[PDB]
Structure 1
Amino acid sequence: MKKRLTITLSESVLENLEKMAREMGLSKSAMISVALENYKKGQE
């Protein structure tokens, strides 16, 4: 299914994330997943 994990981010990055999530209407977890997916997509 799906699991959980704990991380650490620079206040700046957290801030920005918090920002991006809020604006895209996503949870922090979501946003991250999206970024991840998108990041990888653009890697191969």
Structure 2
Amino acid sequence: MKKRLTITLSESVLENLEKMAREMGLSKSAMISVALENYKKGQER
């Protein structure tokens, strides 16, 4: 299913997250998902 969870971010990281998500027209959850998969592919299979 969908899974709900609460994370803690520094204010700077959260502000950049919002900015990036808004620039891409994504929710922050979707922006984090893209970031996680980009990182995963960028180092590992």
TM superposition score category, shorter chain reference: over 0.9
The normalised TM-score by structure 2 is 0.91
CA RMSD of aligned residues (A): 0.6
List structure 1 segments (4+ residues) > 4 angstroms apart after TM superposition. none
**CA distance in 1 between partners of 2:37 and 2:16 (Å):** 18
**CA distance in 2 between partners of 1:38 and 1:10 (Å):** 21
Question: Runs of 5+ in structure 2 lacking a partner?
Answer: none
Identity %: 100
The normalised TM-score by structure 1 is 0.93
Deviation per CA, 1:5-43: give whole Å up to 9, x if none: 000000000000000000000000000000001110111
Aligned length: 44
| Matched position secondary structure for 2:13 | helix
